[PDB]
Amino acid sequence: MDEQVIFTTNTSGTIASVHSFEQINLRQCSTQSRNSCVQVGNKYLFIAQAQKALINVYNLSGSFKRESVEQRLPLPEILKCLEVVENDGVQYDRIQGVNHNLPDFNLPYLLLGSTESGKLYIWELNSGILLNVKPMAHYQSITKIKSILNGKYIITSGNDSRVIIWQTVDLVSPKPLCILHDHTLPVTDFQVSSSQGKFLSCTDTKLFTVSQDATIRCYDLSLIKTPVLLATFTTPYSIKSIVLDPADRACYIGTAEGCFSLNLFYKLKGNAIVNLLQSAGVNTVQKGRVFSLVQRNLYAMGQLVCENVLNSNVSCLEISMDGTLLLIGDTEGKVSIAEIYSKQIIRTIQTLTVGEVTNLLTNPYRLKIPNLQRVIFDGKNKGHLHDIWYQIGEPEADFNAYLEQVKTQESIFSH
Amino acid sequence: MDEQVIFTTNTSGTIASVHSFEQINLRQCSTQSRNSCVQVGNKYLFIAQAQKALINVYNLESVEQRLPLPEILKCLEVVENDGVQYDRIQGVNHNLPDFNLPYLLLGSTESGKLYIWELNSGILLNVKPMAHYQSITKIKSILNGKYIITSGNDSRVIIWQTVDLVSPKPLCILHDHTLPVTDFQVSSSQGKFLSCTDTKLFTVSQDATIRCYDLSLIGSKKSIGKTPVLLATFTTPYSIKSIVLDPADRACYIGTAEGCFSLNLFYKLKGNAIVNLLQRVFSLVQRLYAMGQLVCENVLNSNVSCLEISMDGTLLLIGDTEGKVSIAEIYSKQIIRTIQTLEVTNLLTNPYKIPNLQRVIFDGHLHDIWYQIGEPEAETNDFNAYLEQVKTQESIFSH
Amino acid sequence: EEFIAVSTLARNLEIAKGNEFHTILATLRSPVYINEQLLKSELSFLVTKILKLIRSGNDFDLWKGCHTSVVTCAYNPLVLSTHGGQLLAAIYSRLEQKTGFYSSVISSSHGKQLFNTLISSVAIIIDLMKNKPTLSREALVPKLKAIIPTLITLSQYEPELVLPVLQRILKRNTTTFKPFTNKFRTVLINLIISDYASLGTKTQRLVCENFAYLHLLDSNWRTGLMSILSQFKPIIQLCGEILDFEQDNELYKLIKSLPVIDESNNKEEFLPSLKLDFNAPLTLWEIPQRLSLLADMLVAFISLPTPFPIRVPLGGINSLCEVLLGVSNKYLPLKKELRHDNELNGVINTILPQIQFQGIRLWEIMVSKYGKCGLSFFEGILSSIELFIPLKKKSNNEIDFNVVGSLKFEFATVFRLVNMILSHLGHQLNIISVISQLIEVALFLSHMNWFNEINDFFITALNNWILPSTPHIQILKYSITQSLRLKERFGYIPESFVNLLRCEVLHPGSERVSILPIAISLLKNINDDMFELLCHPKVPVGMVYQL
Amino acid sequence: EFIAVSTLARNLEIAKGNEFHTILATLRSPVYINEQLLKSELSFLVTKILKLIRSGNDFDLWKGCHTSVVTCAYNPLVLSTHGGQLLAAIYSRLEQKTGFYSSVISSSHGKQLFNTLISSVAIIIDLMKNKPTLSREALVPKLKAIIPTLITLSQYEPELVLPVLQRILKRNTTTFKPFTNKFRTVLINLIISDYASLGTKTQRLVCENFAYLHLLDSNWRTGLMSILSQFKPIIQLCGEILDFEQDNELYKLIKSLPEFLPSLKLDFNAPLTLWEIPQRLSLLADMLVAFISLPTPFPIRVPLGGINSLCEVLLGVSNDNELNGVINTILPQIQFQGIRLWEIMVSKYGKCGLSFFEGILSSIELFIPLKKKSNNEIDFNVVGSLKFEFATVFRLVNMILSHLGHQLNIISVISQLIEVALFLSHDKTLIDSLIYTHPELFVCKNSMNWFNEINDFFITALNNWILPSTPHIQILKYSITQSLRLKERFGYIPESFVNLLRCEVLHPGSERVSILPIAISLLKNINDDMFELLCHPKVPVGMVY
Amino acid sequence: RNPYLIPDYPQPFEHLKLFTRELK
């Protein structure tokens, strides 16, 4: 096994595994956007082009992957952001366990896509049907969308410094739940805890929000109510991007003049270790502490020590499944695979064929599509047949049981 | 709740309930101890008789059997058997049989002679002639049968591991007091398999000192076991005789001379803050924290012999030195009911033929036991299954 | 060498009883008789001896021979790849000789298990040879052209045994089945037009599944599906002769808006229509029996795997299920053309909820498979479940619990459906009146997968919303009392009550008096690992809290 | 309102499936207990049922007994009024239909007929036991004539009759008395037979009924010790081929042990006749299990040290050409009858016999087949046959550790068992000794129902032991690789693997670093709430007030 | 010292050999 890196620059489409030193340059790709790519249904990859008003579709399932464009998908408008709502809870057959294999044709439910001027397009993917369009949600832009639980809630962030939490059933059948104005300048990114539950009443789900205000805001999400922040940090540099550890043990922030780290289980000078993020369910106080960051060159002054990792002008970050490596995308269009503790680059991936790293993704792995409808909306009709394309997938198909059958069989004969 | 309540003086004993005015006295009882009685199963009630060298056994009226013994013994405990009302082969629940008994009977006398009997067939299984060098005040099974704790007037607590007690060499020894140990309690939770990795031991002696220990290093195998670390200790004003807990554990109720006092473990400081004291040395007072002291509240003024919590965490049962027990309520600190008979050696509560013992140790040899398995619940439902069964037989008939 | 001298086993197969024959079978399972050079001298002796058992016998040598043939084909690739065709041809020859005379072997009182053993052995030898490509081409398939129609005619009398074998053959060897499909179809239609209640659920399921799999030869699946879906609107309109649909004129318009297609299908419309005289009050059960007959075929057409996608019309199915739940006496009154008769009204009151229960069954299978692909009306199907709940004759939400006892089987599916829905939605919904009724239903019915489903429902309710005090304390008393009952009567508590107690404890409902001391003392000794982490974390946490 | 039960009765003389099932379904309703239909309308239904049972075409009889069963089960008045008459009719038809058995089983519906009649009699006399006043004067004058017919029918149909006689013998121990010898004869005739043509259920039932035969304090002990004493001759018969006194501590115990069956003969020129030895020991073990694991109306003496010694000497039995090949297979099956007995001695008695829970785990190491040459290496080719037995071993260990718990000291049997379980978790192939261009199609792939058992065993191992390094790293690699493989094949991870990863995170033991963040990377879109608590811990459980 | 924290040595999880490929 090994991990798989899918990153794309403004003119380049490289795909490469971390421990292989082999890579595939996708031929046609163009982006000027921060988060515009997504991997769909373990068979496809969607990339939203810039200045063409269409999505390119690459097939990534093969042993020898398709370098070329498998398919195109025109759109009404050039749109920047993307997100997918993965369908889950259908393959187990909960009524009786049969453990269905995946079909060769699988797809998610939704394709969230957002454009400039704040407009949100959402599309059923099994059949291209534009269920709903919100004309205006943010009033300047959207920069990132993410579904935090399986299909339950989605979170959006734009350049109006407002981070919005929807509810998918109140968005597809809109009036969102809660809005977050704590920043003063454009929110460039956010991240949410990889460890999650099935609900929000009994979890404390952490939402880290990052802007050009040089602040990092950690919100506790447990509703049943509004979310309460419990810490906010401050930075001298204009912070750009962020990722977490896979257990909410640390934070790694990407910015101009380097990538910095920060331990959330902060170790003091008595062998005393303080959790900055402690919380409960709905009963929780609103007294969000303030701290400030300062590099390496004990915390009751209102200061914390971040440890400098790198000096590169990073655009994007991602993390490995171990939680020990960072993959950082610089502005010279190349990725550095670095180790967190020693602060020593182990690998440098470039593209072969230039701009910066627009987006990148990682997931571990072992060794036709409908057209989208441009301005059409499925109304309140009941005589309409909401047809979709779907496939179920076969189920998985000793000797002592056979002999017991034989023993029961033998009694019937008198011979 | 409506639990039944038991208590025994040095002259008599009785059984009653909290929400009723019905009482059942016991004919023959004579006792001097803090813990000399226990119910075995749901049926029987053992009491160690004073100055006669035998047990009295009662049903839940009059003495049913009398168990002669080698010696006059002071303390009793029983290790219940579990994992028998449900078959992990067949998947069937079983009813309790008419004859059910625990595995073991742990008896102790003065001078530390710990007797270990098997109750199904009365067999002297093991004898430790000196375990404390003093008397034994209380012996207990913390977990189901895993470990056996015993304290004595040698000011030591001993942790025996039960499985290598029946086939010697104890596991942990705790000498951190200067005077006889009078009482101890345990707070625990259990994983999928039962062990001690979060359990907490509260120890209480005539030193006017409460001592709290964490037992999570005991399985580490560095006596045998790696010693625990004490996480907290308190210093009381008075000579303390008993301790009981809340079952959520939230509060420690200490029974001493001059009334029973109450500590909150989740100590509420000023503003909105709470501090847990059981994740140090402290000094208690009667009726803010970095001074080094904590504030108690008092519920009674009477001399106390024994304590017991209700199941619903709201009613104390304090057995005083005058042969009566008071049923209290914590939020009001008011009495609801006073039970008397017609001091208190022991007190306990729960919600709703025997072999004679041996005097010579057991050394293949037919190690027999009396036993009874008990019927399933199907011998003490759905129609659609019967309907499918009669449906599929219709196809077999054709003329 | 520690071999067991295989020629001695073959010397003993011809004359053997159970106590030795089973050990003979267990020895042939050894993975030591798979050497190449043994294939000429002694394995041939084994094979020809078994063939003597098959080719002649007293109907006990046949059983012995087919069983040992299966065992020595599964655990020897050499024997399979050499003589599987011969063994298969032998047992099929005996099966062809037997299927000619079904009546005379059934009056021997061993023929049924004989056909069972024959068909199972043939099926095993088939499914061993199907995924080996060289052993299939011109070594399995030219026998299939003889094997299909022999199994077709035997499905008429013994359908439970055969139909899975034919299902696998159709799914894998589809093109070889093309000449026989109509010959198969006219067998299935006769079992369906026949009583269809002498068959259990398993055989009905197989019948519907095979009838679906006939339609494999992108589009014919859709034609058969829409054809079955079109045969509901007549039956629902015939239910209008009992009770008026003209009252609301919203259910009426939805009944008009259901699909029907005519003069484009006579190959899947094969079913008679219903007379339904209201002078025989026991003849109205034809309606829900017909509706079950249609719904089984419908979910077979939906819920089966295929080597292609399906243009499945979910909107029409949701419209249909909304229509089926509209059938009730609580909002729609009885027709005045029919005259009142106590027995007739009694069978009407008892037969309407089954008609609703079929729509619930179809929604269950529509949400089990296709989860989060019909999410746009999951709130509506939660709203229409309230129509299932029965009320008294005063519409002020007085529930009649005497009838609810007759619907425990049907309400189990309802709670399962609700649990499956709420595991896809958020926590802000407008369905609290439905939850408050469902809780009252469950608390009546409780006082054994029933406990698991209702406890998961309570967990969903307590993790989604802050409920009112009275249902909350009712749930708390229920969980506490039942867990105490099982632990005083037995030694353990199951996992469902444990997770229910944990959800109760962590809920913000905290002011109750039995939550704090009783719900935790039961968990302190239960041996659950999830509760250990609450009492002892595995990560640093502050000694002091600001709450 | 009311469905006019006369209408049900008149539509009942002709009713096929989709009418007869509605007739049975609507007769469950409790509104047929009500005033002034209790003497004129229920009489009509009962006379109809009686006319169906008294004479019919063997379809009206099946229909009729099912109808009477449903009616008497859902209406106590029909029981208290007419249950004796219904049961008398049904017994009369059973008597005429078992007076002949080889002219009634000739059409493939006599079997079902006996099934329905026996089941209906059983159901009726299982509902007339909750009424003392009704168990008098409808059953007790009838059991004397019911029981010999059931005994004569049990000679041919033991799978169907023996539970009925078991329940009747158990609840009535004084009317089964004068027929008891007649029962015993047939049970010795069913044990003198081959006893492998009978199923496990039927074998267990004949053993259980032979055990309950001795209810008539002390007779249970005599039968139990007789079966216990019939073990030692067979072991000494097996000792002439294994050459004991190579180890004398075993032979000291073999002679420390304490009748209708035949003394058996063995021939070495016919080595298959050595399969009589396991097929006697399994019989005696089943009979011993019956005498031990059954309930009673009184307590019983059970020797536990005796059977523990018996199990101890059974697993000591281990290490011209084909004879050696046959000797290399009977002995694991012999040891497994010690395994099978300890599994019943453990669960049913629990903490009684705590003294023996440490010797059993050491003796299980003898069951493992080792390589022959000198070594301590595991013989995996023998292990491939023994899959069910090792599953039984794993359940035995899990039964023990429910009571023992976490263990300070470690033992070597557990590491070898882990190596076994990891061998068994690999997809078997049976072409390895050697193609036809595809050797990957000849595999036997392991179901999830087997992985659940293996993963529960590894849960028990990781909970209660600080294992060595390599038998831990193998477990972690197995869990991660299989979880990723299934998450690729499926779209999710099954629950047993999630429980395994939970135990690997919670109980790392000797490791210096957890596998927590990798479990969360795999559990990316399959969320779970254990690791939320671990990473995002909660306020304690009593701070709220 | 704590298993559930970021350790103080550079390459943890190298002794699980997930990402190594053995040469044959």
Side-chain angles (χ1 to χ4, degrees), chain A residues 112-261:
Chain A
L112 271 279
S114 163
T115 183
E116 191 166 300
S117 92
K119 198 180 291 305
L120 194 63
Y121 289 91
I122 78 197
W123 278 290
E124 183 171 76
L125 266 176
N126 299 273
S127 47
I129 309 182
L130 174 48
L131 290 160
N132 199 296
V133 171
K134 201 77 154 56
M136 196 74 93
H138 289 60
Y139 309 113
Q140 279 107 288
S141 166
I142 316 201
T143 68
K144 181 148 151 90
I145 298 156
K146 191 181 165 169
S147 177
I148 44 154
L149 299 174
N150 302 92
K152 300 203 192 199
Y153 314 88
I154 74 182
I155 289 144
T156 62
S157 70
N159 291 1
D160 209 339
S161 319
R162 60 202 288 164
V163 169
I164 320 182
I165 320 190
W166 306 91
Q167 208 179 259
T168 311
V169 309
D170 303 358
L171 184 61
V172 84
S173 64
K175 190 73 199 66
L177 296 182
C178 33
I179 288 151
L180 299 168
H181 255 274
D182 296 284
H183 285 109
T184 73
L185 306 177
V187 167
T188 58
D189 212 317
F190 61 95
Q191 274 286 1
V192 192
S193 308
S194 45
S195 194
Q196 286 187 85
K198 299 283 165 190
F199 297 98
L200 300 158
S201 304
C202 63
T203 71
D204 308 336
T205 324
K206 267 68 184 275
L207 163 63
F208 283 62
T209 324
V210 179
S211 86
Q212 320 194 134
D213 218 316
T215 42
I216 295 153
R217 288 173 188 281
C218 318
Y219 299 89
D220 183 19
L221 316 186
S222 302
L223 300 323
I224 198 165
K225 280 285 165 86
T226 76
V228 298
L229 83 178
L230 66 179
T232 166
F233 313 123
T234 310
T235 323
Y237 300 113
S238 180
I239 185 171
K240 207 82 70 48
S241 301
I242 172 153
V243 84
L244 315 178
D245 224 28
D248 183 337
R249 295 179 314 188
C251 173
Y252 313 89
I253 54 183
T255 183
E257 181 56 30
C259 155
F260 300 106
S261 69

Side-chain angles (χ1 to χ4, degrees), chain C residues 350-455:
Chain C
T350 204
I351 198 166
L352 293 187
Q354 298 292 321
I355 302 161
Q356 294 189 109
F357 173 55
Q358 299 301 310
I360 275 148
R361 199 206 284 191
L362 191 54
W363 264 333
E364 181 175 336
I365 287 142
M366 198 266 266
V367 177
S368 178
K369 330 256 192 148
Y370 301 82
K372 205 167 272 148
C373 295
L375 184 61
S376 35
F377 34 62
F378 277 17
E379 80 297 352
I381 74 195
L382 283 156
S383 82
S384 38
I385 283 154
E386 191 169 18
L387 281 47
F388 191 79
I389 291 158
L391 303 183
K392 304 228 183 166
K393 310 304 178 288
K394 299 151 183 175
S395 95
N396 45 340
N397 314 267
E398 309 177 314
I399 286 158
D400 47 347
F401 299 99
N402 291 15
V403 296
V404 165
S406 73
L407 294 153
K408 206 167 150 55
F409 189 91
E410 291 86 325
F411 266 99
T413 40
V414 169
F415 290 121
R416 193 174 305 129
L417 169 52
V418 167
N419 300 348
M420 285 213 296
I421 289 153
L422 299 172
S423 61
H424 291 128
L425 328 174
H427 79 95
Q428 177 157 104
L429 303 166
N430 203 245
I431 48 150
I432 56 145
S433 184
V434 188
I435 305 310
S436 307
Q437 293 172 312
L438 285 156
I439 289 153
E440 212 157 81
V441 167
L443 297 158
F444 176 76
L445 287 160
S446 73
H447 312 133
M448 286 287 202
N449 312 44
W450 165 256
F451 289 133
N452 287 257
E453 298 296 341
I454 70 196
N455 285 351

Side-chain angles (χ1 to χ4, degrees), chain B residues 51-108:
Chain B
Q51 310 292 292
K52 281 194 180 292
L54 39 69
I55 308 307
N56 287 5
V57 48
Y58 301 115
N59 61 328
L60 312 188
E61 173 170 329
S62 307
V63 171
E64 302 198 302
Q65 309 288 7
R66 301 178 161 284
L67 308 189
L69 299 172
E71 294 188 52
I72 310 99
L73 85 185
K74 198 77 88 183
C75 295
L76 255 57
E77 173 65 332
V78 299
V79 187
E80 302 185 358
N81 195 353
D82 288 345
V84 281
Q85 297 185 86
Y86 180 79
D87 209 317
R88 307 200 193 83
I89 300 152
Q90 306 289 122
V92 309
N93 304 19
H94 276 262
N95 301 125
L96 273 179
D98 263 348
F99 180 80
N100 52 320
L101 278 176
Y103 181 27
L104 288 182
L105 172 47
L106 277 295
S108 163

Side-chain angles (χ1 to χ4, degrees), chain D residues 150-327:
Chain D
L150 300 168
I151 288 151
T152 49
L153 184 63
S154 165
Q155 305 176 100
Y156 322 96
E157 295 201 338
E159 57 267 15
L160 281 183
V161 175
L162 293 174
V164 175
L165 295 157
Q166 164 159 235
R167 289 174 283 188
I168 290 298
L169 180 66
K170 179 152 51 164
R171 298 194 289 234
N172 314 130
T173 58
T174 194
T175 70
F176 224 116
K177 170 68 183 183
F179 311 121
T180 297
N181 299 274
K182 285 199 224 176
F183 199 2
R184 195 186 281 130
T185 52
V186 316
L187 283 156
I188 59 169
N189 301 333
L190 269 79
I191 287 152
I192 289 279
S193 86
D194 287 287
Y195 207 73
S197 44
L198 308 172
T200 50
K201 274 65 65 166
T202 318
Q203 286 160 267
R204 206 153 65 215
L205 289 157
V206 296
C207 281
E208 285 167 279
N209 285 66
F210 185 65
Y212 280 123
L213 205 85
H214 301 277
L215 281 159
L216 274 35
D217 310 346
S218 66
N219 314 133
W220 196 283
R221 178 63 172 209
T222 67
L224 168 51
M225 296 300 300
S226 78
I227 287 148
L228 186 59
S229 39
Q230 285 150 247
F231 262 98
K232 162 158 162 279
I234 315 312
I235 288 154
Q236 288 186 331
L237 188 132
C238 175
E240 77 203 37
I241 56 168
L242 207 77
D243 201 346
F244 307 140
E245 311 177 68
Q246 238 61 129
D247 178 278
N248 190 26
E249 56 174 21
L250 196 74
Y251 187 56
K252 286 320 301 161
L253 184 57
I254 282 151
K255 61 180 74 174
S256 292
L257 274 297
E259 293 177 350
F260 54 90
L261 272 148
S263 63
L264 50 75
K265 292 179 179 179
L266 76 172
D267 294 347
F268 292 107
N269 309 67
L272 271 286
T273 66
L274 302 182
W275 280 102
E276 298 280 301
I277 280 148
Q279 293 179 328
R280 175 60 65 81
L281 289 162
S282 181
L283 198 185
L284 299 168
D286 294 354
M287 298 267 264
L288 185 52
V289 160
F291 270 102
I292 276 152
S293 67
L294 278 178
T296 57
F298 42 76
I300 43 153
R301 311 224 63 162
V302 54
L304 223 58
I307 70 187
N308 202 85
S309 48
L310 184 78
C311 297
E312 275 184 346
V313 300
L314 272 153
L315 281 92
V317 190
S318 74
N319 323 128
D320 195 357
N321 206 330
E322 78 198 25
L323 172 51
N324 186 20
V326 165
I327 280 150

Side-chain angles (χ1 to χ4, degrees), chain A residues 87 93-95 109 151 153 167 177 199 201 224 278 285 382 387-388 390-391 394 402 409-410 415, chain C residues 17-18 22 63 67 171 222 306 309-310 312 319 369 371-373 416 423 427-428 463-464 541-542 546:
Chain A
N87 196 350
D93 203 77
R94 303 143 149 161
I95 305 303
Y109 181 36
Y153 314 88
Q167 208 179 259
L177 296 182
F199 297 98
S201 304
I224 198 165
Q278 304 182 93
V285 309
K382 299 289 206 187
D387 292 89
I388 44 147
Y390 208 72
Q391 206 203 138
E394 279 263 321
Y402 200 100
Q409 279 170 359
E410 198 179 322
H415 314 321
Chain C
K17 305 308 305 210
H22 310 139
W63 178 74
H67 274 305
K171 192 148 57 171
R222 207 189 189 202
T306 59
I310 301 147
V312 60
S319 306
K369 330 256 192 148
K372 205 167 272 148
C373 295
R416 193 174 305 129
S423 61
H427 79 95
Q428 177 157 104
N463 277 322
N464 277 21
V541 71
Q546 293 96 46

Side-chain angles (χ1 to χ4, degrees), chain A residues 40-41 44 46 87 105-109 125-126 369-370 389-390, chain C residues 373:
Chain A
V40 167
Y44 300 111
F46 284 22
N87 196 350
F105 186 79
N106 51 355
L107 288 175
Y109 181 36
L125 266 176
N126 299 273
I369 305 145
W389 298 88
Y390 208 72
Chain C
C373 295

